[PDB]
Write a protein that binds this ligand. Structure first.
Ligand SMILES: O=c1ccn([C@@H]2O[C@H](COP(=O)(O)OP(=O)(O)O[C@@H]3O[C@H](CO)[C@H](O)[C@@H](O)[C@H]3O)[C@@H](O)[C@H]2O)c(=O)[nH]1
Ligand SMILES: [Mg+2]
Length: 333
């Protein structure tokens, strides 16, 4: 696909196929074989491709303070919006009924499984594609019209993937493994009680297309200082995930992270050490760098320089471009 793009850029770069493909960020990374044939019939053929429909799904519990700004941010850009309420005790449903009558409201007991609630929306959705957003997110106005173009180009090339907008924390931390959107063609389901993500039902990990969409995330802003509250909820769920895979370094990391967020640094260090130990021979090393960086932060703060040296050396070996290595090195000499 990077080849096809290089020629679409060269050979006349004002085709609607050119623009729309440029919404995709990590094109260089997509390695499945697309039979390059002739950019001419490809350009022309795109013009007649169908513009897929997209459902926007929101799972909600007690979001009175936020749901209106959230829905105002998505009200223009989706064929269908489904809100799945877990029997809120605040006035969440009534705000939606009043100000967003075209939103479909469905109800479902919370079962302490974020993947169950999301998959419930997938069952209810009638569009060709789904995109999930949370009540403490804002969909950027600059996204106007783009999410359907993304889905159009992906259907065109029959790319099986999930789709990640950039999500910006209040901190300015920018995430690109967010996996919020995918085609509703019976291939992808959410898996996990917490920290859930959409998996092929053989439980393999879909390719992740990063796209030039932006979503703001207010949910850990000190405006609402919900930090410790959301954290205690998630750690009870992370603990269940860990029981089922007590050697999984990803779950060990998330548990350590949440112990740390709950001012339990002692207790975090042991889980992070075991996570880092188990990551060496693990296939999905996505959070290996975050485990190392967090552990080095904790050891540094506790003046445990001897152990900090051990993990900083591992950090720099595995991730020589890590932007945090120089900081730790400067703090101990
Ligand atoms: O019992 C609940 C709790 C939460 N939500 C909704 O789930 C969403 C995400 O919950 P949130 O308050 O934002 O916790 P966060 O810590 O900000 O992250 C979230 O952590 C969750 C669990 O992994 C989410 O699914 C992820 O999208 C992640 O961004 C919200 O729209 C909530 O209203 C429910 O529907 N029912
Ligand atoms: Mg949130």
């Amino acid at each position: 696909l990077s080849d096809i793009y290089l020629e679409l850029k060269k050979g006349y770069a004002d085709s609607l196929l050119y623009s729309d493909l440029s919404l995709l960020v990590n094109i260089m990374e997509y390695e499945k074989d697309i039979d390059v044939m002739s950019i001419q019939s490809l350009v022309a053929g795109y013009e007649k491709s169908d513009t897929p429909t997209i459902t926007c799904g929101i799972i909600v519990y007690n979001e009175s303070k936020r749901i209106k700004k959230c829905l105002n941010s998505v009200k223009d850009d989706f064929n269908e919006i489904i809100v799945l309420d877990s029997y809120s005790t605040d006035d969440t449903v009534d705000i939606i009924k009043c100000d967003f009558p075209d939103v479909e409201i469905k109800y479902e007991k919370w079962k302490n499984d974020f993947s169950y609630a999301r998959n419930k929306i997938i069952e209810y959705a009638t569009s060709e594609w789904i995109y999930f957003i949370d009540a403490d997110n804002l969909y950027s106005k600059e996204n106007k019209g783009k999410i359907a173009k993304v889905a159009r180009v992906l259907e065109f090339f029959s790319i099986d993937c999930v789709v990640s907008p950039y999500i910006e924390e209040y901190t300015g931390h920018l995430y690109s493994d967010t996996r919020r959107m995918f085609r509703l063609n019976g291939k992808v389901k959410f898996h996990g009680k917490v920290h859930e993500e959409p998996m092929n039902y053989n439980h393999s990990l879909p390719f992740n297309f990063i796209v030039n969409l932006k979503v703001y995330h207010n949910g850990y802003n000190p405006s609402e200082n919900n930090i410790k509250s959301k954290t205690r909820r998630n750690i009870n769920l992370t603990e269940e995930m860990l029981r089922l895979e007590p050697e999984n370094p990803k779950w060990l990391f998330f548990f350590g992270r949440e112990l740390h967020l709950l001012d339990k640094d002692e207790e975090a260090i042991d889980y992070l050490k075991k996570s880092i130990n188990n990551y060496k021979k693990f296939n999905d090393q996505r959070h290996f760098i975050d485990a190392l960086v967090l552990l080095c932060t904790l050891l540094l703060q506790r003046n445990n320089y001897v152990d900090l040296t051990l993990y900083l050396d591992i950090l720099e070996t595995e991730y020589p471009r890590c932007v945090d290595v120089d900081y730790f090195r400067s703090a101990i000499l």
